[PDB]
Amino acid sequence: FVKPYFQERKHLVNVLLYAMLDLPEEELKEKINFNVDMKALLSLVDTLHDSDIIRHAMLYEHILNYYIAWVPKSSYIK
Amino acid sequence: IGINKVLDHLAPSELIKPVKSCHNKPSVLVLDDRIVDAATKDLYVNGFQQNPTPENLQHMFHQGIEILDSARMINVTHLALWKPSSFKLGNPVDFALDDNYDTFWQSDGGQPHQLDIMFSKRMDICVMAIFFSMIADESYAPSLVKVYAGHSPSDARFYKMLEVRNVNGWVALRFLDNREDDQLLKCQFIRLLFPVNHENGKDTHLRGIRLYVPSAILR
Amino acid sequence: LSDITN
């Protein structure tokens, strides 16, 4: 429901990928002409880095185990 | 708890399966008589040696029978039902089991010839005796033999391979792969196949065949 | 001799 609004805004790709790679603010300020909140930046880096979210023996174990416990547009719900 | 423990004993799984890394190819047995070895001497009785004359073959045929019967053993070749793939109206399997080199049995029909050995009661075969004549019956010589096993015509399964190059004598085949503890075979259904003969033959004879199993007064 | 090959 939300993605078209993201494509409506232009600078979203650059800031998000720079947020993904955690670049320093100095490189942001060189070629970006609008102010970016450093507190918002540090907060999003913290959220991004939040992490709270033999071969014959596995065939007997895992293949059997996957069917020991089982419950019923692609998946896309990773 | 006795019920739970015995169930584990009948069907051990975690203890049994080591790696499950079987090669799954069929093992082939070498029957050649030009190499002298202790294992070959156990399976080949007549001894390693020009082609002998037929009377010499008859003489060694009797001496092979005598040696095989010399040891403590019980013959139950006549204690089972036999049904070959097809006859030729000249010689039934009786002359194959008559223990005579002169007479012999011949099939006539499809190329994968079948020889059926059905048993009435659970008999534990230990040594199977078969006689080949490469020089005497080169036209109808058995070149490849596959021996099956099972408890019924339904559950016939592959046991062993046998390739023929030059064997003019009795062949002894004791069974050890199936059961190392018993050193014998336990089945009620045995069938033999002869898919192809030497030098691209058509039919096959069988000079001899025998089955071996283990166990004051007034006249 | 029979057993004629193809």
From Swiss-Prot, chain A:
Localisation: Cytoplasm; Nucleus
Function summary: Component of the anaphase promoting complex/cyclosome (APC/C), a cell cycle-regulated E3 ubiquitin-protein ligase complex that controls progression through mitosis and the G1 phase of the cell cycle. The APC/C is thought to confer substrate specificity and, in the presence of ubiquitin-conjugating E2 enzymes, it catalyzes the formation of protein-ubiquitin conjugates that are subsequently degraded by the 26S proteasome.
Family membership noted in the UniProt record: Belongs to the cullin family.
Binding partners and assembly: The APC/C is composed of at least 13 subunits that stay tightly associated throughout the cell cycle: APC1, APC2, APC4, APC5, APC9, APC11, CDC16, CDC23, CDC26, CDC27, DOC1, MND2 and SWM1. APC2 interacts directly with APC11 thereby anchoring APC11 to the core complex.
Other facts noted in the record for this chain: Present with 432 molecules/cell in log phase SD medium.
Name of the protein in question: Anaphase-promoting complex subunit 2
Origin species: Saccharomyces cerevisiae (strain ATCC 204508 / S288c)
Span of the entire protein shown here: 367 to 488 of 853
From Swiss-Prot, chain B:
The keyword rRNA-binding appears for this protein: no
Record has Nucleus as a keyword: yes
Sequence ranges assigned to domain DOC in this UniProt record: 52-215
GO terms of molecular function: enzyme regulator activity
UniProt GO cellular component terms: anaphase-promoting complex; mitochondrion
Keywords per UniProt: Cell cycle, Cell division, Cytoplasm, Mitosis, Nucleus, Ubl conjugation pathway
Pathway annotation from the record: Protein modification; protein ubiquitination
Entry-linked CDD domains: APC10 (cd08366)
Leader sequence residues: none
Compartmental location: Cytoplasm; Nucleus
Subunit: The APC/C is composed of at least 13 subunits that stay tightly associated throughout the cell cycle: APC1, APC2, APC4, APC5, APC9, APC11, CDC16, CDC23, CDC26, CDC27, DOC1, MND2 and SWM1.
Similarity annotation: Belongs to the APC10 family.
Remaining remarks: Present with 1364 molecules/cell in log phase SD medium.
UniProt name for this protein: Anaphase-promoting complex subunit DOC1
Gene: DOC1
